[PDB]
């Protein structure tokens, strides 16, 4: 809920909690440190959003393959599991001789 | 705390520091809750179709507007002198200010 709260804090360009600035405006400003406001023409705003559409679907579609983002996640839940198995096999190790 | 820094500075607000939480530029930032730690989507900005043009940055050459040691400005020709940002090749009207 909070992540949705975090995300939709930008998704209401009427009233937004990402520095108070509207979102469709906000895509034209982090570019404007590098790109030019005249250059996006308001044209590439639709093209970046269509690419953002093309991002988010391919974000969904590229996720099903073995991705780097899944990579560390499967590692750490294994890095937990290898630790506890080393902790559990420890219980039956016969330190003393009997 | 690196994540706290990223959710406070990359996610929530905008950036004035450049090379933080990724590479290149940072167009947007998102956040989705993932198992055992949240994870983001750093929407980086990648150009494709490169070109070329002559450029003379320091204005060591050919003052037309009288006594111009102006600076801070890129160069392409065929206008008089034009400024381009470091992403999109485009002539301005004039230099910035």
């Amino acid at each position: 809920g909070y992540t949705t709260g975090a995300t939709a804090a930008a998704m209401f360009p009427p009233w937004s909690a990402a520095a108070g600035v509207p979102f469709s405006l906000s895509v034209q400003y982090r570019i404007n440190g590098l790109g030019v406001t005249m250059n996006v023409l308001s044209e590439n705003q639709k093209m970046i959003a269509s690419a953002f559409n093309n991002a988010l679907g391919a974000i969904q579609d590229g996720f099903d393959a073995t991705n780097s983002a899944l990579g560390k996640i499967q590692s750490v839940v294994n890095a937990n599991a290898e630790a506890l198995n080393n902790l559990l096999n420890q219980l039956s190790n016969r330190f003393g001789a009997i | 705390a690196q994540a706290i820094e990223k959710v406070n500075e990359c996610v929530k607000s905008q950036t004035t520091r450049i090379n933080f939480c990724g590479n290149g530029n940072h167009i947007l930032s998102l956040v989705q809750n993932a198992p055992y730690g949240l994870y983001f989507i750093h929407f980086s900005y990648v150009p494709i179709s490169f070109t070329t043009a002559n450029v003379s940055p320091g204005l060591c050459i050919s003052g037309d507007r009288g006594l111009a040691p102006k600076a801070g400005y890129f160069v392409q020709d065929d206008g008089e002198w034009k400024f381009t940002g470091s992403s999109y090749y485009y002539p301005e009207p004039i230099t910035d200010k």
Binding site: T4, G5, T7, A8, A9, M11, F12, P13, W15, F23, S24, V27, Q45, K46, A49, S50, F52, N53, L56, G57, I59, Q60, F63, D64, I73 | Q32, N33, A34, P35
Partner: peptide
């Protein structure tokens, strides 16, 4: 988060209602 909350997009940046939590269940 003002309730007066609807589940469709209004800004033109698409799927931000769809990909808001579709990426959740894939994880």
């Amino acid at each position: 988060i003002s309730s007066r909350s609807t589940c469709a997009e209004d800004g033109n940046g698409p799927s931000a209602i769809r990909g808001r939590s579709a990426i959740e269940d894939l994880l």
